[PDB]
Amino acid sequence: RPYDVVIIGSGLSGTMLGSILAKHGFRIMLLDGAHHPRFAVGESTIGQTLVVLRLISDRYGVPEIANLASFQDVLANVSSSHGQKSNFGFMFHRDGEEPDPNETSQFRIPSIVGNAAHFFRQDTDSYMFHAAVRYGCDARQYYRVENIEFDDGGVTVSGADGSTVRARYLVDASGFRSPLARQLGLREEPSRLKHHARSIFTHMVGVDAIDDHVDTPAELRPPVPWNDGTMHHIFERGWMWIIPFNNHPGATNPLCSVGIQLDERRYPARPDLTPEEEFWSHVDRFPAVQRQLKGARSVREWVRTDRMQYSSSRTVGERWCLMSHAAGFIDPLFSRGLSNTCEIINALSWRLMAALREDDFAVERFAYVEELEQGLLDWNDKLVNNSFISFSHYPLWNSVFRIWASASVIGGKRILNALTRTKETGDDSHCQALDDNPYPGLWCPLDFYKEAFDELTELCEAVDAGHTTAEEAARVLEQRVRESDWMLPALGFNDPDTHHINPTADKMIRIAEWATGHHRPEIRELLAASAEEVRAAMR
């Protein structure tokens, strides 16, 4: 009679979980206040999300999830309406000034982690919702949750329409408005998080490529276009994203995702301005951004937020789980959101199914999911807070950037090797061993990385508290980078004067040779391979 699981929120987190549970013969109800199709933000993918999507798909036997793990599979299976992401781009702007071409950074994503996308979320979320319903999930859309009641036998969810849903377990896969977080008072008030930012964002038609509106010397031009990736316009205590859906030949979607993050402590609310007027007031500060957006028109009602950050004291209890985005949020910066979502679905799914099967809901079974959830948010907090502090001074940012981007290659390889070894042998142990790491939520959980990132964090926070200058901090971190032995030297991560990291087959072969003889066992374990093996992997 009762549902096994009621999932509140029919976005990607809810429908990926619902697809896994429904495919394995469980009885699922998806509840959402909205109806597909609908706009959702969280558009840019990273290497980690790609490999973890593939990992979830293989581990739980849901092919539809692996179709989100590459630009090619999204186009072929979801819709034509998505953009490519070959790179992360960063460009510093000062008020009334042209951008300095020596204050840019680019990370071109290596082929081995896969081909990143700009997700048009209305289509990815419709796609996974249709998959969830096809696997046997029941759904109620335009369904507002008013009340959640727990007893010894399960949970009762009451709608505004006067109806009730009875289930054995509740997953809240909503956002800030999480009905469960409100019902149980799970929100930390005030929030423990150090990062401060509010947002203004929309979708625009007629956004130009930044590549066509900057006066850059031929030799300082990036190896791949800015417009082929996620462009980050950096300024004092804020940044603006430019995420085109039309940045490839014969792209059907003419839209561009556009938003600004502002630290609300340094940029106070302007309720006298409309969202759009406040957006353009920031555009008009930066001549090159003004030229890029000159013909850009909003095709949506603007979103303008207060401080966006939130955190929870508890994310799992008896017969309930708070999914990543319902538990906490930092910032769009670095697109950690969808990675965190995938880490939690991987860890939760087999634990929840074992609990449902045994009919045992002891919170002890979900202890790792709590630890991972809080760890992801706290590590994500430091990375973004460190970046926002560094935006005041490029030589400081320059260290943040290569420490972040180096870990993205080492971290991705770690998850890809585990997945590869699990497919070769059929032994799930290689994937389960990922959970046995000392730093749950850290994207590259190795002692030498933890130590480098702790020192980065200590110095950035010192700059923010006024204990040290951005210059002082930049000098110390630049020397540490220059003294490093682990920062993938063939790719240029250990060279502060290399601003555009451009992986090529030749450099990836050299990394494998460099790794073979390395004194660090983790470098050998993750990166060591013959020339022939690296070519075999790139086929």
The site string for ligand FAD over 25-64 (x = CB under 6 A, - otherwise) reads ------xxxx-----xxxxx--------------------
The secondary structure element, H or E, covering residue 164 is: strand 164-172
How far apart CA 270 and CA 53 sit, in angstroms, is 40
CB 32 within 8 A of CB 183: no
Minimum Å distance from CB 115 to ligand FAD? 16
Give the residue with the Cβ less far from ligand FAD, 179 or 496. Answer: 179
**243-271: b (≥16 Cβ within 10 Å) or e:** bbbbbeeebebebbbbbbbbbbeebeeee
Using CB under 8 A, list all residues that contact a second copy: 35-39, 75-81, 122-123, 129-130, 133-134, 136, 139-142, 205-206, 250, 252-255, 297-301
145 binds, among a second copy, ligand FAD, Cl ion, none (CB under 5 to 8 A by kind): ligand FAD
Identify which of 226, 135, 237 has the alpha carbon closest to the alpha carbon of residue 195.
Answer: 237
Residue 134 contact, options Cl ion, ligand FAD, a second copy, none, Cβ 5-8 Å cut-off depending on partner type: a second copy
Which amino acid, 471? E
6 - beta bridge partners?
A: 29, 170
Single residue of 6, 50, 256, 323 touching ligand FAD by CB under 6 A: 323
Do the Cβ atoms of 171 and 17 come closer than 8 Å?
A: yes
Shortest separation between residue 332's beta carbon and Cl ion, angstroms: 5
CA distance 531 to 534: 5
Residue 504, Cβ density class (10 Å: 0-12 exposed, 13-18 middle, ≥19 buried): middle
**Closest CB 3 distance from Cl ion, rounded Å:** 30
13 is in an annotated binding site: yes
CA distances from 223 to 90, 117, 501 (A): 14, 19, 9
Which residue from 59, 336, 382, 499 is in contact with Cl ion, where contact means CB under 5 A? 336
The reply on whether position 337 binds Cl ion by CB under 5 A is yes
Residue 15: exposure state from Cβ atoms within 10 A (0-12, 13-18, ≥19): buried
Which of positions 222-261 make contact with ligand FAD (CB under 6 A)? 259
14 annotated as ligand-binding = yes
Annotate 309-334 with b (16+ C-beta within 10 A) or e (fewer).
bbbbebbbbebbbbbbbbbbbbbbbb
Which of the listed partners (Cl ion, ligand FAD, a second copy, none) does 174 bind, with a CB threshold of 5 to 8 Å by partner kind? ligand FAD
Cβ closer to a second copy: 96 or 250? 250
The contact mask relative to ligand FAD for 184-223 (x = CB under 6 A, - = no) is ---------------x-x----------------------
Residues that constitute the known binding site: 9-14
Q: Which residues bind ligand FAD (CB under 6 A)?
A: 8-14, 31-34, 40-44, 144-145, 173-175, 177, 179, 199, 201, 259, 308, 323, 325, 332, 335, 337-338, 341
